[model samples]
Target: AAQTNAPWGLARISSTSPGTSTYYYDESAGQGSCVYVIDTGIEASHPEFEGRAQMVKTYYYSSRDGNGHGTHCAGTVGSRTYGVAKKTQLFGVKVLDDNGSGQYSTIIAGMDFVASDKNNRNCPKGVVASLSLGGGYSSSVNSAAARLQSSGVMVAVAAGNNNADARNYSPASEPSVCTVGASDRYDRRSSFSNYGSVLDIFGPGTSILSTWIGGSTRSISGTSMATPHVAGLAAYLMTLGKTTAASACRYIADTANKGDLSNIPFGTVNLLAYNNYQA
Candidate 1:
């Protein structure tokens, strides 16, 4: 339990503000890593992204984010004023269709692309995948994620916004992935966030303000937003030499602030603390 002090503004953002004490406030801007946001796609040229986003095509059906979901999620993970690893590269792995619908097979293919070392997706040093999308549980994602983690890819998947047990979904339910839940600026579990043994940690999601399409930003809430906070934190850890997925998960599990989740189980709801941890 570090502090429950987010008093104002979009609690997801990090900057000089009255509520900086409550947000996932960290200054550890990374320099040599990448967090690939696997979703609809990112507005790669958004100013908040600082031209750090690289969009890769997984399918013609998944080319750009017509729904703005992916770009918004990407902003939370890497925007200069609203991210934990602001300097790290932001790669977009388009998996969903224009209307935010994608088959699990599409998602699995996107996972394959992100985890592979080819198609210009390799990062010799570090690479983490942030998937803000989810569907019903699938053995395909389970095996794919297991294979990728062995291949040196770290994955952070949303625990879904359904408030049910995360074990019912793919990737989130899968092994060897860091499943994330949603916490507000106050560090309390959100009403819509999934929970249980399937999740790894909690991050800011309620009223999160992040970059959106068209060089703008908006306040949105979901475990999708929370997933990025953990992903960004993972990327930051990679800059500190925690390259392996096991080490990254271990460090986060051991050091997260966990005293503020009132109704939730203690160890399962460790609050992300970026203000204090350096390196």
Candidate 2:
């Protein structure tokens, strides 16, 4: 029987071929490595993620897997055979409960855990934290994000799925954090992707496919899934000595496939190129 709706469908576009089983080869080949997902715990036993995921640390600030948003986001960023950075290590942090809601304190605590490495030694040494969830801005969150940057931890956040200006959200709105917007396979800004000068980069987020519970495949839509694409890229770039968060952002923005300035908003962006700096 043929698999009808697999979660890896979306990743196929960016892989070597469209809808081809190339990601397995990609993962087997290996590229840059290591990323930490600060979201719901992944279904560690899924075939697509077998032997590719490592839960360096886990946190239950709230209940578990209420809305399945975090799991989808994790799969997009670092799921073994079904994600952008397939060879990268993933760490899960559960701040939001099954209802897809969590308190600011819980989110902050998760960030603190990453920054301090209280429970995990895999902290702040070339690990990028992909945060796909956040709403409303906060000075405290900004401070925490800046602290993580100073401690050598890169944070990537979703620009929000509302399509409104992203300046309205916290963490993502924070200048110190890398705010990611969504683009389609053609590299155009997704209709629902929040935009503004604050947006740091864009990635494939529309109709993303990722892991669902019970080892099933599901298609999801949101800037949340897109944020991890850039986050995974950041981790890859970090392996090549692009360590600082700002440097990672610069590399994506400057190297992305850019189009005519008139085609996008005054400050909107697209990926224009790849591997330009290798010379």
Candidate 3:
């Protein structure tokens, strides 16, 4: 039921309890699904991607992932070795600069593009958008995410690392998006992960090891790290015919490992993400 090669985050989701040292997954592993990574960009040439990652759109002049944040998130979503959905197609939609920062309007532009992209209609299974950035509330950004979701793209967003209520953050606070919180390998809530009722599920965020920009791997922590894990799960479910955004979101939330996490805030759910696989 476990193997040493897979990342701990991937291993945890397939098991029912903590302390699992190996990863278990269905062989389908998100085949035929597409996950759009909306952030700094991704290194499509990274070996971990195995030729499945590509830049579909960019707000920057270059489509390369200079900051490495987007590449790392993409790896977690669908890298061959470190991803939750090993076979999913990854599309990097760059909206942030090299510093991993972007204006709300620029971010909205990326969201709007994905909502209307022809690739959405071409995906074999379904399309998902993984958004790992969050800031103070912006009504426009919230509206954009809502529209993206309404267009049948499964939207997963970070609850932020502010350690405060996620309600004050845009996109994350948007009721239509699947807002994700972060948990540690020990099933405890990450100290810096935002909490509250807005979160749809929790995923392994602390010390997540995934592909980076320099053709290497990095261990990072944050709700940003956690968001893509849920995104990957959504993609995996989509491959199994949970094609619409609403269906994938509902399945992930409803089938998650309920009350398995510790140190959850009062108003937050204790649900942790699961891939519905057993070895």
Local accuracy of candidate 3 as per-residue lDDT tens digits, 91-190: 9999999899999999999999999883544677788999999989998999999998888899999999999999999899998899999999999999
> Order the candidates by TM-score, highest first — what do you get?
3, 1, 2
Residue 120 Cα positional deviation in candidate 2, in Å, after optimal superposition: 3.1
Clashing pairs in 2: 66-98, 67-98, 136-170, 137-170, 256-271, 256-272, 257-271, 257-272, 258-271, 258-272
> Pick by TM-score: which candidate is best?
3
Candidate 1 vs 3: which has more lDDT = 3
Candidate 1 residue-wise lDDT, 36-147, digit = tens? 8888899888888888887876576446677788988888777876666777788888888768778878788888887774336545447778889888888898777666
The superposed Cα distance between candidate 1 and the true structure at residue 268, in angstroms, equals 3.6
Model 3: lowest-lDDT 10 consecutive positions: 117-126
Question: Candidate 2 — which residues are off by over 4 angstroms?
Answer: 1-32, 54-66, 122-125, 242-246, 260-263, 271-279
lDDT of each: 0.71, 0.64, 0.89
Give the per-residue lDDT digits (tens) of candidate 2, residues 199-240: 877766777777766667677777787777777767656655
Comparing candidate 2 with candidate 3, which one achieves the higher TM-score?
3
With candidate 1 superimposed using the best TM-score fit, by how many Å does residue 206's alpha carbon deviate from the native? Answer: 1.1
